[PDB]
Structures are given as structure tokens and as C-alpha cells.
């Protein structure tokens, strides 16, 4: 031990098979007396918007943070006149299924309110980039399984067909023990014949929010509130729920599917309530972590395709408080791909591949500027990117045998760089993830178009997330951001007691 | 006009037409008696070495800063098989001339020793990025007119063809009071026929390098020397003098001209020793400003074309002091042009368009990253760039009017950035334009090939000019750099009695 | 004429401002004054033509 320049202190550790002996204790695990579940059929609901209001039985009854709502529906497709031909049915065995996640990508904006105070997530645009981010294979296969789950990898559906992994495929043709393709989900068909299709079944989808959690790691439950209400509203077109492929749709013509129509019944949220046992009392007022996520977006009308890069810059934006992290990406632009049935159904959700980033921050310019794009990936994976370096970084070639074919290139989605703010930006002294007040940052970066078939007009987002504390008391809901005072942060004590990677589990 | 905001003083001034009253002296301009022009014929010259040894007649003689060599020459070219080809004469009315500037573009290194202290500069590479950069129109028709001087504005000679700005045109074809094409520079031809061409003339060229000058205005000469000299060593290939247009050759000739053998006859330099009037004395030991060119070129093999975009970097290179100015540009790499007679003659010396430049000053990164490539121009023309924005970033579109025909694009010879180092980088303090030492920089810029016809391996250059003072006395030649303490600079008084524009005049 | 008609359309557009922050030691005065010129124009029309 004291063989080095500085004697370092020794300890011995018993190898696992011979771990015995050490004092062992019998451990008794105590849950609350009564644990219950009830459906709340939405008190008011219609075509374009529906909502619930579901008061807890009493204060003094903790509630399960893991929530979800189940929605029964009806879709019927009509056969479009007059794309030429039309032989083979209207639905295909490998060519179409629900977009994932089906009822989340519809939702314009979720909105809950805890205890008289409002908390809200804009849900539609946000979910597709957030969802990439924290799932491993255990989690993607747990709760996250309920809605159709398989994110879209192929930059353009048509050429995907028919790979083992094709985003939309049936249950057969998925590998044993791994994320199953979107076509596996059960929807009974009342009738599928060329000219017409009608299909009908229930579909589940969680409330993605904070406090409420979607990932498994359990955490303490919301007590002690009095009122709870949820609100939802649907982003207009709503044909978008469905997905499709180009292969079936025909030369210099139109797709066969357009147009369809949808219909719902009354959907019902599902809340749990555990009422704690008489031995241990729950504290008068209590405090919960609470993160709120925004989005700031930019449109630039010009176009590039199939593969030539240019620069785009995002209008300078202000923040009220250093957010705990922020994602950056570019993607196909929302203003287009909303008009036209074909355009709505069959265009996948994916990202142009980032060639290099160069953000600035209050004011500076440029942080992260001189790092290979490669380098953005491997510092994002550190926060849990979970997709192979090749899935990120766009396209992959492919050669064929036979003279003389051309060698087909495939686009397959570009990554989304994410940087924690202490972890990767570096803040000037005595600013830390909570601290208020005023900052502004404008990312600017370059991106190359990946796919071969269409011209992509683009847009870019920036999703910032703010982390603070919220005090559900009886009865109020003071919510605080800027919990750490600036002077305060300077001279805070450093504990080696709590390891860092431990604080990577808290999420939100 | 003590009515505005905070009040201020008013002075009245006189219109030019009438002053008319003011104490008007008469200034007798005296310059020393017995001005003389010497003509030293080089002794010891070969095809590879010019070697003048030229002493001043006394101490007390003050020789003038503008020096220049003249050199008679003899070239012969002989047609190649198998072309072919060929009908026509070997030299063409538009196709050829000398490369500006003939004498320098061949010199490996010019070298001179003021008073036993060796001062040299490398002429071959540095000079073509030096030409573009400090001459307006007025100066281009002044002294610099003696060697061919018109700059290479087309990306490849073949495209310029017959055009009004075409570099290699006759005397006709260049408007009045305008820079002449290099074909107009006189030479007399013993024979020009198919198979053979034999030409002869006289070439001037001004000795470049400090403390001599090729600027028009001039300052005070270098009394009081006892020694002087000059030595040019030349590249052995020496075919680089001529320039030829690709149009004639066709495919697989590939070209008519090669080979060719150049020859020199003893050259002779011209110095001008004035001597001051007895009455007015010159000081015993006297001081002058003195700059010093330094270059590092970095080559990376990879080849982009005809018009791909890429990125590069240079190995870090430490410096011993802040340099007054700094020049960055991507050239068509040298190594590829040297092999072969065909190639050496028929490739103009031009630069690739800079899409964006980002560089790092010492241990500091991201500088200039955010600024638009058009912005690079804005602050560099302010330095004195003298060339239409259109030619910087060069590429131009001329469309033809006849059905079944595509329009054609023309490569235009990109630019070369330069950033005075206290002006355009900004400096942490106290640091100046001279202070030692040890800062380390590296550059990483993204370029685009614009040349329409050839794949181009590129290369990067960085020229700096360190600043200091050279003090000559008989008999010594002390030279310094640093010159001011890092503390003494921190508190020297800013004087309003000069115009920053005064320091633009002392090139440099 | 040959044309006809035409339509124009702009994409995102962007200003480019220079800045620089005066070196900490030297102090720029609190209140400063610059020259400024207001350019204004008027015109008068005429009914009869010449040619």
C-alpha cells in the first residue's frame, strides 16, 4: 500500500463466494393499507379536444405518479380516385401501421393542473426527440411498451421494404426478444377490401409529464393534493396518426389511400391511490422535483436536396434561468407535410444529419465549435443517446451484384445532439443549473440532407428544460425556479458522499 | 455650437475659394549634391545563381530604398510528338506570355546582407499572395509596371479564351489608363513556326523584401553601410516562367509545347547612391523599421472535385511573438503542379473560395467562426484588398441563348483573407503588435473547389510578418523583436496627434 | 414583351453587426456625441409631356 509516492490506505474485500460472514439483518417491507385503481371516463370530450377532472378521494391518500389514458377509436379509409390500377387490398401486410406513438403525436398540447396550479407540456413536436433519449432495452420493453413503440429509423419508408427491422412490419419477422415493429399491435379489422377499409380497437398512451413519470424507476407519489384535472387538445389534421409506404403508390401518380377519417369514444384516464397505514404519518407539506420543458423554433423557407449542405441560424432567444440541459436538432419542416393526405400519412419522422455544430451562449461564440461532428455524438451518448453511431450520422451505402446496376444509397435519419449545461458547456463561475436570472443563446449550425427521394425544406428546434422545486401543500402549489441563490452557489460544500452518475437516474 | 446636449466649441473655417489671409512661407527644398546611379553587372552568374557584390563608395553616402535588377534572357521551345496535330504556329496571339512576375516566380530564395547581417525572404510562394494585397490602381501603373504584373483572374486559362480581361491578351484589348494584359509586354521573336519557337528580350524585376520597397511613396535611405550584396538561387525546373492556354492541346496530345530550355546572360542590378550636402550632417548611428516574412505550409493528400466542399486543419504552430499581420489562404497544392512540363506551364495560380474560416488564437478557440465569409471580405478590404467582392468567393454564371443548350458556369479565382492582429483578432492585455513571446495558433477553414475542369489536391498557407527595428551603424546591424516590455505597454499614453491611417502607409 | 409575368420570394434574411469590447484598462466616457444628417426629399409633378 505505502509503496507509492504517497502512502495510500489499504482495505481487504471478501471475494463473492466467500462473502460470509458479516452481520445480516432481516428486513421488513411496509406498504400502505389500501391500494386501488379506477377508470375516469372523461367528463367532457369531443372531436377536436377532450378532458378529465378526477379529484383524489381525500388529502392523506398518496397517488401513483405513473398515469395513462386508454382511448377507443374508429378509422375508415376510402379508396382515392383515380390513381391508375388498384389491384391488391387497401391495407397491406407489411406496408402500413400506426405511427408511434400514435395518440401522442396527435395531441397539440397536454395540460394538467396540480392542486389549482397549472403545469403544461406542449406534446406534439416535443415527443419525437424526447423519446429517442432515455430508453435502453429493459425500459423500451417495460411500461414504454403499451403504445406502438418502435421509433422510425429509415429516412424514407419506401426503400425500407422489406427488411427484418422495417419500421412497419408484422409480429412475425421481428427478432426473438427485442423491440417489435409497429404492425404488431392489435387492431381488429371489420373489413378490408380494395375501395374501402374499416378498423377498430383500444389504444393506450401514458401522460408524459413532470411530475408524472413514464420510465420505470419508481419514485415517491403525489400527496397531499385536493384537485386534479387533465386537459388535452388535438393538433388539427389528425390523419397523421396513421403511417404508410410509397412502394404501393404508383408511378408519377397519387397514393391509393387518400382520403380517410377518424372517430373516438369516451377515453378514460387511470389513476392509482395508496392510502398509507396508520403506523407512519405523512408530513403536512412536501416538496417534489419539477422540470418544465419549452421549445423555441425557426423556419427558413429555402430548400436543399437530395444531398448538399448549407448553414442555418436560429433566432437569438432568451432564457429566464440556465436550463438543466438543452437539445438541438433539425428535422423536416412542419409548415409543409400538413397539406395533402399523401404528404401527411407516408412521410416519416426523422432528422437531417448534423455535420458540425457551433452554438454560442451569452454571448461568446463559439462553444463546441471546433469539435468533429463525430465528437458531438460520443458526448451525447454519455447522456444516453442509445442509437448506434451509424444510425446517427445519416446515410449508409449498399452495393449489388450484376453488371451494370448503380449502387444504391440509403438515408436513415440523423441524430439530435444533446448537451447537459454544467457537463458540456461550462458556465462562468457561480452559475449552476438552477440559478436565475438573465441569459440568451443562439445556436447556429450546418446540416446535410440525407435522403434521396424528396426535397426537404427544413426547420430547427431547441428544447430547453428548466429544473426547480415544487411544493404540493395543503392547500396550495407554490412552484419555485431559481432555488439556488447565486452567492449561495459559490460556497456550497463538496460531498464525495453522493456519486455523480447516481444523479443521472433522476431524469425528467 | 453651445446648444447641443452637452455643449462644445465651434471654430470657423474658410472655404477653398477664399482664405485668403494666412502666413504663407516659401519652402526651399534641399537634397544633397552629387546623386548618382550605379550599374553593377553581376559577376559569377549561372542559369541557377545571380550574384552581385556591391559596396557603397563611402560612409556618408545614403543609398536609396528602391532597388531593381534587370536580366536579358533567351528561351527556346520545341514541339512535341505525337500530339497531334499540328497545324499552326507554336506561339499564339492570345494563348501565351510570361507569368507575372517572371523573375520572382522562379526564384527559390532571394537573399541580401545589409552590412554583414544576413536578411532573406523566400520569393517563390509568398509573392503571389503578396501581389493581390497592397496595391490600388494608381500604384499598379506606377513602379510595379516594370515586370509583367496583371494578376490571374480566371480559374483555368482555357475558359477565359477571348475575353476583354483575359490575362494573356495583346496591347489592343485593354482600355485606356488600365492594367495591361501580359501579352502586351515586349519581346522580339527571331522565329516562330510550327515545330520551333525562339524568343529574346529583357526582364526587369524589383528586389522585394524589407527594408527595400515596392510601394510608391518611399522614406529615407540606409546610410551608413560598408557592405551590401545580393544572391538569388533559382529552382532547377525553370520552365515555370512561361504561361500557356489549354485551348490548343485537346485530349491526349496532351499538349504541343514541351520541352523548352531557358537561358540567362549576365544580369545587372541598379543602385542609387546620393550623398548629402556638407553643411547638413547625418547622425552616426541611425534606426529603421524592419519586418520579416515567415511561412508554414501544410499538405493533406485528399482530393475534392469538381466542386465538393470539405474541411481541413493545420498542425499547431507556436510563435515567438504576436505578428503585425497574418495571411490565410488555400492554394492549389504545389506538389502536384511540379511534375511534368505540360502541367507546370498551363496552370494559373489562384485560390479556392472560402466558405467559412474559423481559427484559434493562443489556447483560445472559435475566433471569427460566426462571421459570414462575406464578412471576411469586409474587414480585409479595409486592410487593402483592391479586388471586387465578385472575384473573392469567385464563381460566375453566364447563360447562353439557344434552345437545347445548358448554361455554363465559370470558376473565378477565390480570395485570401488577412487580419491585422490587434485589429481583427483582438488581444488580451497587455499584449501588443510586437511583444514576446510564445503564443500558439492553428487554423481550421472549410473550402470549396470552384475550378470547373480539374480535381485539385489542396494545401494551406499562413504567412505572418513579425515586426521590430533594425539599427545600422558603421559597422554593425543590430536587430530586435519584442522591443517593448509587457508592462511598459500597459501604460503608454494614447496620443491623438496621429491618424491610424498614417500607420496604414508604413507597409508592411 | 417576352415576360410575361414573374414572382419573387425571399427566404430567411439576416443582419450582420460588428461589435468589440473596449480593453478593460481604457475607459470610454459615459455620454458621447456623433455627427448625423437627416436626408429628406420633395418632388413636383407635371401634366404635359415633351418628346
UniProtKB/Swiss-Prot annotation, chains A, B:
Origin superkingdom: Viruses
Pfam families linked: MCP_V20_C (PF22031), Sputnik_MCP_1st (PF21915)
Gene Ontology cellular-component annotations: viral capsid
Purpose of the protein: May self assemble to form an icosahedral capsid. Most abundant protein in the virion.
UniProt source species: Sputnik virophage
Subcellular location: Virion
Protein name in UniProt: Putative capsid protein V20
Record InterPro entries: MCP_V20_C (IPR053887), Sputnik_MCP_N (IPR053889)
Alphabetic keyword roster: Capsid protein, Virion
